[PDB]
RNA sequence: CUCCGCCGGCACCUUAUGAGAAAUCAAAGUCUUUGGGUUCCGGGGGGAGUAUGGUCGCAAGGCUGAAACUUAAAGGAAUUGACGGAAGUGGUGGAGCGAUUUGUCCUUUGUACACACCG
RNA sequence: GUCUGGUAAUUGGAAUGAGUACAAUCUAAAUCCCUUAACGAGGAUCCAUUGGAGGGCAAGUCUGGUGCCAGCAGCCGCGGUAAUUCCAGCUCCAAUAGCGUAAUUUAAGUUGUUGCAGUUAAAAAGCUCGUAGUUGGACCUUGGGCCGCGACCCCGUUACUUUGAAGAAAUUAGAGUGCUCAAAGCAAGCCAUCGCUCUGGAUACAUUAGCAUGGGAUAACAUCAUAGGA
């Protein structure tokens, strides 16, 4: 059983403190390892397109996901960022500013794309959605 | 349950087990109701009777026979039967 | 420091926890169509107000009938519910406040009462009439259709004196047409 | 049209009964659904879910369909039927009959002052089926049904306006979720409360009441 | 060891009532158990009970009338002010209409309603309904 | 792989790492 | 992998212009239309 | 030796009025009607009882014990079928939370297979 | 047939503010608002969007294109020629002047004090002793009546509880009050008043620790036959 005594407040508090480290979410929050991530705790980061690459999907699916290799500016960390919206790889060029965001699963890989948790959202200051919908044009 | 106006608000008032005082539910199909007839002098059956209802729980335990025999001793004493 | 930072403000509604439930969508649309609402947020804010009133009434019901706070705040709540026409005279208890629905609050809008008074042909015609500044409550013209009308102000809902439907001069459409003629 | 095969069915056909609570008083088993239709006319009917169950065979899989059906008059009577059949239409038809056959009384009470008509569960009540445990807490008038979709439907057909609920276990197993809620509603005329402390008068059972007819 | 004699008394009574027994023997006896039993009897949830003196910790033989759904202790005996009685009754009682929480107060051992009537707080012994 | 043999394999790599880093 | 086929299908898809249709009422009137359709008058988009 | 009791012990049989996901358990019961006391200890699956630090040991090793990263299951009980280099079709009613089962008396048995061992 | 409903870039007159603008008002000066001449709607182009339409989850097993590619997909999945899921058109759905996307709360009784687990799913130390810690059997002034819910009669502590004083304001809860409503604000109201309503500008909450009052059931500590008592 568990301790129930009126004078056992310290026992209960210390036990809860020690057991909270078993929870994955608690330990992810309070370990400090999220500051060693490429984004270092920020929702978005900017980076330089180093080279356009195509990485194969998982086993059941057969596709080339056509991501981008991005070197961040805040820390110089190289990441792979997915480019959604069919045809948007042609808006991506080497040595071009891009705003990266998370792939929506908090550093966990998403879908059939292995090892990618980052998507390109903005290129050269123009959103990829605007370029897909032809609402704006990429500056020369 | 009575309303503050003064009306009964329950659909019905269920029977209680005569031995364990437990409420006899509508789907308690192991429950029964025994009518013990009343006899006057010479052994003739009057046409009146006492009623006992036993829940399915007390019958399932097996104490139904002893419970019913004790209840009948008590009422027989009281009504001179 | 900026003094304007001390002015209070707050939210008037919440969104549903389940966005795509058929039954709730049908009920909300039925109420919206019945009362000519512009969106679901107008019904959601009425539900928010009803929620706060209901919470207050429930909290005083969970206190003794001699608790001086329940005597005082329940009297104030009953006064407020009788003032805006939400409760009858026989309904003079905190229990009846818990039974109020968003229908009761929507029935006290200036749009609903303008429609039911015969001034407008439909609930939507009532909404436009109020938003066109044709309606006054007492001497004050009200262009806000979510205006909650008190029982003492119900008999003073009337057409504006500056409005063409309330003894005023003709509107620009009519005047332009006669000038053309 | 209908030939009653039970003694209870005969009396219901003739009209010796007017309400289903006379059957409830004596805990009689109801085995003909025409009895419930005769005595509880305001019954609605809703199919909660259809589930495919597969029995592995030598040649592929034998698929049958399980239908869950809830009936009720929204005035203190609710019933749940589960029928599995080779055809969906007959699975639903069989479940409606079973749901009517399991129409049980539901006790309704007041959260606070007993003003107006009962609107909530009289007391805290719990039902369990499989790993699913369903708790129902009496709620103040106007609270509505604070429950998941599956128990909300059964509470609406039971005639309960206000109730707080909590559930634990795999409520994703809808058969258990609905059965646990129905068991919770059934165990509501069974909690002894001081208002039921008055001794039972033991009226005559309809079997002995109409032995002249039967 | 025996830590709470009240818990053993109430649990034995609960088990006997569930079993349909009409008499339950309580050992050991104590003033707190007789005081809890008096509250129980006053509210009509039990019948006669008899203290049997054995020149030791006593014995209590209680008549059961089938009106008990549950009786139990709360351990620890948490401090309950008059204002926290509402929260405790919501936690432990089936409804706001029935059920009793038993408190030990400097004014005596009493049910929560009687504690409200004298505005006296204390510690929770248990509950019955 | 059987858990006993996995443990034996891991004890062998550890012997090796120990005899390398320490010596 | 090969990046040459990026934009293949969207470039292949023939361009179909949008029909110039009447605007639907906006706001309270739109809710009036929806209320009428689903309360005073197969799914909403059944291919009948 | 025989019979009847009492206390204590290793156990066994039946039964559900109980509990349980069930297997099953007379405790694994007296739990959403949740509180007798107390110790240790778990928080999806791997990485991993691995690295490192510390400590004990002659050593073998023991005790304490991560992270990065990876993954959508892993796992438990039970059912039907299939397989074994194992043995010799409704209805209604009943049982089961249920898949199912009884009825229908190839069967029993094991299974980590279910595209079903050509696994 | 009549009665009553919904539909049409049909057909008609009404209505009006977005905008423009005399002016006044505003204002330190300006400006915005409020007010208001004149003007200002028919496809009232004075043109509403953001996301979706396999399931979760509301809405299509419509049409064309692509054909395990391009792509979508939070998850399960879709795409190999009949794609309800990609690219589009049409239609429909949700919210709506907003909506989509990328730490924390809820959901989570998946941290569990209330309130989770540990035979087989993750989890009882191999076993026992043992300090601290936590937890510890029962027992001691009760009845009784009277007056009248109080009372009457026959120089050990502490926890706990009760009451009181404090615990800034703002924030929160909440009384009053028609800023046109509302979010607000702390104003205001009065038949019109050389003034008045002393106008209002409440109240509640505020752990723990501290101070004080009553209570002693429960419990803790200290004693507890040199009482060697007085
Ligand atoms: K023995
Ligand atoms: K059968
Ligand atoms: Mg527990
Ligand atoms: Mg783990
Ligand atoms: Mg069957
Ligand atoms: Mg749908
Ligand atoms: Mg499409
Ligand atoms: Mg768990
Ligand atoms: Mg194992
Ligand atoms: Mg294990
Ligand atoms: Mg003691």
Swiss-Prot record, chain F:
Keyword line:
Ribonucleoprotein, Ribosomal protein
Q: Where is this region: Disordered?
A: 1-23
Q: Might you report a single GO cellular component term?
A: ribonucleoprotein complex
**Record keywords: Iron-sulfur included?**
no
Q: What processes does the entry annotate via GO biological process terms?
A: translation
Paired cysteines (S-S): none
Q: Which InterPro entries match?
A: Ribosomal_eS32
State whether keyword Transmembrane applies: no
Coiled-coil intervals, chain numbering: none
- Return one GO MF term: structural constituent of ribosome
Kindly give any further remark recorded in the entry. Answer: Initially thought to be part of the large ribosomal subunit. Crystal structures show eS32/eL41 to be a small ribosomal subunit forming a bridge at the interface of the 2 subunits.
Quaternary assembly: Component of the small ribosomal subunit (SSU).
Family membership, please give it: Belongs to the eukaryotic ribosomal protein eS32 family.
Indicate what this protein is called per its UniProt record. Small ribosomal subunit protein eS32 eS32z/eS32y/eS32x/eS32w/eS32v
Which source organism does the UniProt entry give?
Arabidopsis thaliana
Q: Which gene encodes it?
A: RPL41A
């Amino acid at each position: 059983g568990k301790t129930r005594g009126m004078g056992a407040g310290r026992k209960l508090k210390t036990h809860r403190r020690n057991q909270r480290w078993a929870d994955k979410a608690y330990k992810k929050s309070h370990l400090g390892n999220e500051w060693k991530k490429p984004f270092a705790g920020s929702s978005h980061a900017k980076g330089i397109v180093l080279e356009k690459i195509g990485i194969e999907a998982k086993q059941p699916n057969s596709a080339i996901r056509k991501c981008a290799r991005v070197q961040l500016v805040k820390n110089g960390k190289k990441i792979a960022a997915f480019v959604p919206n069919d045809g948007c790889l042609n808006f991506i060029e080497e040595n071009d500013e891009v705003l990266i965001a998370g792939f929506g699963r908090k550093g966990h890989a998403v879908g059939d794309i292995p090892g990618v948790r980052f998507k390109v959202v903005k290129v050269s200051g123009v959103s990829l959605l605007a370029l897909f919908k032809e609402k704006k044009e990429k500056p020369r | 349950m009575q309303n503050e106006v003064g009306d009964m608000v329950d659909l019905y008032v269920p029977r209680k087990c005569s031995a364990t005082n437990r409420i006899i539910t509508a789907k308690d199909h192991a429950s029964v109701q025994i009518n013990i007839g009343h006899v006057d002098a010479n052994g003739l059956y009057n046409g009146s009777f006492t009623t006992f209802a036993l829940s399915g729980f007390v019958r399932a335990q097996g104490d139904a026979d002893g419970s019913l025999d004790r209840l009948w001793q008590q009422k027989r004493a009281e009504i001179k039967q | 420091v900026h003094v304007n930072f001390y002015r209070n403000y707050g939210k008037t509604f919440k969104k549903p926890r389940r966005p795509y439930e058929k039954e709730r969508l049908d009920a909300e649309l039925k109420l919206v169509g019945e009362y000519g609402l512009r969106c679901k947020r107008e019904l959601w804010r009425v539900q928010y107000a009803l929620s706060r009133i209901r919470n207050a009434a429930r909290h005083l019901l969970t206190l003794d009938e001699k608790n001086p706070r329940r005597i005082f705040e329940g009297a104030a709540l009953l006064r407020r519910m009788n003032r805006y026409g939400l409760l009858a005279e026989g309904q003079d208890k905190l229990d009846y406040v818990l039974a109020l629905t968003a229908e009761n609050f929507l029935a006290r809008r200036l749009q609903t009462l303008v429609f039911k008074a015969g001034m407008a042909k439909s609930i939507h015609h009532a909404r436009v009439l109020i938003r066109q500044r044709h309606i006054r409550v007492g001497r004050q013209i009200v262009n806000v259709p979510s205006f909650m009308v008190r029982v003492e102000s119900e008999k003073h809902i009337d057409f504006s004196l500056t409005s063409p439907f309330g003894g005023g001069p003709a509107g620009r459409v009519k005047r332009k047409n006669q000038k053309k003629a | 049209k209908w030939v009653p095969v039970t003694k209870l069915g005969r009396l219901v056909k003739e009209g010796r009964f007017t309400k289903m609570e006379e059957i409830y008083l004596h805990s009689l088993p109801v085995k003909e659904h025409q009895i419930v239709e005769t005595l509880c006319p305001g019954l609605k009917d809703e199919v909660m879910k259809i589930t495919p169950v597969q029995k592995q065979t030598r040649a592929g899989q034998r698929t049958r369909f399980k239908a869950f059906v809830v009936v009720g008059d929204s005035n203190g009577h609710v019933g749940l039927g589960v029928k599995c059949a080779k055809e969906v239409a007959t699975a639903i038809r069989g479940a409606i009959i079973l749901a009517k056959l399991s129409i049980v009384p539901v006790r309704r009470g007041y959260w606070g002052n007993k003003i107006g008509l009962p609107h909530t569960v009289p007391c805290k009540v719990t039902g369990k089926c499989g790993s699913v445990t369903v708790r129902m807490v009496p709620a103040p008038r106007g609270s509505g049904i604070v429950a998941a979709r599956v128990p909300k439907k059964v509470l609406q057909f039971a005639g309960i306006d206000d109730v707080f609920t909590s559930s634990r276990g795999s409520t994703k197993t809808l058969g258990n979720f609905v059965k646990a809620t129905f068991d919770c509603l059934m165990k509501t005329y069974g909690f002894l409360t001081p208002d039921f402390w008055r001794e039972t008068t033991f009226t005559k059972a309809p079997y002995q009441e109409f032995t002249d007819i039967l | 060891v025996r830590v709470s004699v009240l818990n053993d008394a109430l649990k034995s009574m609960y088990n006997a009532e569930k079993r349909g027994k009409r008499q339950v023997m309580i050992r050991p006896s104590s003033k707190v158990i007789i005081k809890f039993l008096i509250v129980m009897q006053k509210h009509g949830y039990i019948g006669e009970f008899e203290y049997v003196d054995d020149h030791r910790s006593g014995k209590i033989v209680v008549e059961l009338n089938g009106r008990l759904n549950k009786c139990g202790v709360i351990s620890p005996r948490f401090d309950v002010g008059v204002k926290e009685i509402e929260g405790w009754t919501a936690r432990l009682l089936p409804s706001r209409q029935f059920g009793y929480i038993v408190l030990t107060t400097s004014a005596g051992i009493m049910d929560h309603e009687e504690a409200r009537r004298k505005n006296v707080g204390g510690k929770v012994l248990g509950f019955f309904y | 792989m059987r858990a006993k043999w996995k443990k034996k394999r891991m004890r062998r790599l550890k012997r090796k790492r120990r005899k390398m880093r320490q010596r | 992998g090969s990046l040459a086929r990026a934009g293949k299908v969207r470039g292949q898809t023939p361009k179909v212009a949008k029909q110039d249709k009447k605007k639907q009422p906006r706001g309270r009137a739109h809710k009036r239309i929806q209320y009428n359709r689903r309360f005073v008058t197969r799914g909403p988009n059944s291919s009948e």
